[PDB]
Amino acid sequence: VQLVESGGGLVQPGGSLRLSCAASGFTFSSYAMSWVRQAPGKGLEWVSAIIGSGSNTYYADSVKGRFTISRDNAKNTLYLQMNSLRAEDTAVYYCAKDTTPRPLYSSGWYGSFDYWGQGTPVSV
Amino acid sequence: TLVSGDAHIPSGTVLGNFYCFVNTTIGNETTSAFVGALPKTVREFVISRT
Amino acid sequence: IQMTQSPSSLSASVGDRVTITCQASQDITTYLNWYQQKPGKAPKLLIYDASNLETGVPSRFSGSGSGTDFTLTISSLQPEDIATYYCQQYDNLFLTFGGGTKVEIK
Ligand SMILES: *[C@@H]1O[C@H](CO)[C@@H](O[C@@H]2O[C@H](CO)[C@@H](O)[C@H](O)[C@H]2NC(C)=O)[C@H](O)[C@H]1NC(C)=O
Ligand SMILES: *[C@@H]1O[C@H](CO)[C@@H](O)[C@H](O)[C@H]1NC(C)=O
Ligand SMILES: *[C@@H]1O[C@H](CO)[C@@H](O)[C@H](O)[C@H]1NC(C)=O
């Protein structure tokens, strides 16, 4: 199992980015995914999560309405769209994989991330 | 049977011929599990990633 | 949901019996995860469901608790265990992590 993130960089306040995370070594469409960030020298904060199908998407209130999560099951790629960034949004963003496989016709719970990516920096 | 170590050898076996085992470690833990028997002479060995 | 872990930091000698707690301020029943983040690397899952030991971490670790109080213990603190530990609930899908706790050898 392997996760690799990309798309980090430096953008002005109010800018936008196209964070991406490729997945390999497991059936991608069976597991929910979530992005979690770590501010410099701070604890982990959950940002957004998406189930396997993609019908349900959840966002934390600090990011609600500004970001947009998506996934493309055809080529095992998880995306995160950042819009109207602020100063406190700067952090290291990790893409995580849940531990519970679920059928593609189901919508379900999540929250036991067993694998994590290397993380990518985002500065504003 | 001293080298195998584990006591879970299934019944119906006959003492006197070679049985193949596997030792699986989980950190500082070691367990012996019985897998079966193999022919006396082998000509090719093949192992898959799965 | 809020989580608070005590102590914020601790230090113990090699082979000691370090114990770190976490509380949920709300009935979580059993839904708690324990992570470990070594400095500069991604976290790893140690315990899920507050007590189920993961398949790739030695039995030195243990976890217990229910409701509002939870606890993670290291039976014999080895030098490899210097890291930051976090508790994370999943009773609500807007899941939250704790503030962390750091260990130290002496
Ligand atoms: C696989 O594990 C077994 C235990 O099931 C080992 O057998 C024991 O090994 C220890 C350590 O050397 C000895 O002190 C004991 O005398 C052994 N026998 C018993 C009955 O406990 C075995 O050595 C391991 N084998 C391999 C090939 O690694
Ligand atoms: C084990 O193998 C040796 C090989 O020389 C053989 O002599 C011996 O009889 C076998 N042991 C038993 C207990 O059958
Ligand atoms: C395993 O634990 C025993 C008892 O503490 C110790 O003697 C042995 O050296 C340890 N080995 C490893 C590889 O952790």
Side-chain angles (χ1 to χ4, degrees):
Chain A
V1 161
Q2 190 58 278
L3 287 318
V4 162
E5 304 97 329
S6 288
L10 176 275
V11 297
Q12 300 71 24
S16 61
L17 273 182
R18 263 297 298 210
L19 260 169
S20 180
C21 155
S24 188
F26 64 96
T27 299
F28 181 71
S29 59
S30 304
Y31 303 76
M33 316 274 288
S34 79
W35 284 97
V36 49
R37 72 184 175 195
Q38 179 161 47
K42 318 293 287 326
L44 309 184
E45 190 205 350
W46 168 82
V47 182
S48 175
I50 182 157
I51 64 166
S53 58
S55 61
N56 286 11
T57 46
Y58 312 89
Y59 303 99
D61 290 296
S62 69
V63 63
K64 175 92 161 259
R66 293 199 293 123
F67 285 25
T68 299
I69 188 72
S70 210
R71 63 170 330 159
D72 164 348
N73 295 278
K75 66 223 217 67
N76 317 343
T77 298
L78 173 74
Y79 294 120
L80 175 61
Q81 177 74 29
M82 292 168 107
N83 293 320
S84 192
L85 287 40
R86 309 157 187 259
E88 71 302 0
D89 286 37
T90 177
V92 175
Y93 285 74
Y94 309 92
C95 64
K97 180 189 144 23
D98 203 326
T99 206
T100 312
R102 228 159 290 251
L104 195 131
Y105 59 91
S106 189
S107 66
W109 220 254
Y110 61 82
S112 194
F113 316 114
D114 53 28
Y115 277 86
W116 296 64
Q118 283 322 339
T120 189
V122 168
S123 59
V124 69
Chain B
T1 207
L2 286 304
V3 185
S4 48
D6 189 35
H8 186 75
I9 168 172
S11 183
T13 59
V14 173
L15 292 96
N17 59 346
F18 279 77
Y19 291 54
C20 303
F21 277 103
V22 68
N23 268 49
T24 167
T25 70
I26 304 290
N28 204 343
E29 180 62 275
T30 292
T31 318
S32 169
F34 177 55
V35 296
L38 285 190
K40 44 213 158 182
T41 73
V42 316
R43 300 304 203 66
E44 167 172 34
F45 196 95
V46 179
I47 178 65
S48 183
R49 181 149 40 71
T50 303
Chain C
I1 304 290
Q2 295 321 137
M3 320 298 251
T4 52
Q5 319 142 243
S6 54
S8 171
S9 322
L10 80 81
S11 321
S13 147
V14 152
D16 213 350
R17 188 252 168 62
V18 158
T19 284
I20 165 67
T21 75
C22 170
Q23 102 160 27
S25 85
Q26 163 51 39
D27 197 348
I28 294 169
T29 82
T30 174
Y31 313 130
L32 190 49
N33 266 290
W34 279 102
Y35 303 90
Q36 156 169 318
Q37 185 178 25
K38 301 218 304 259
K41 336 309 312 306
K44 272 196 329 168
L45 177 63
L46 303 186
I47 306 183
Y48 62 96
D49 192 53
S51 60
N52 297 347
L53 177 63
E54 192 53 273
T55 193
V57 52
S59 59
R60 298 176 325 91
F61 295 88
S62 167
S64 60
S66 281
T68 55
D69 309 33
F70 297 92
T71 296
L72 159 71
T73 85
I74 303 102
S75 60
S76 42
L77 171 50
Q78 299 307 72
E80 315 75 301
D81 300 11
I82 68 108
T84 309
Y85 294 85
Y86 300 99
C87 62
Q88 181 247 331
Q89 57 89 25
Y90 53 71
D91 178 300
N92 173 318
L93 288 184
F94 294 83
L95 43 77
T96 61
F97 286 67
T101 174
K102 217 191 85 63
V103 302
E104 288 302 38
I105 312 297
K106 196 24 58 192

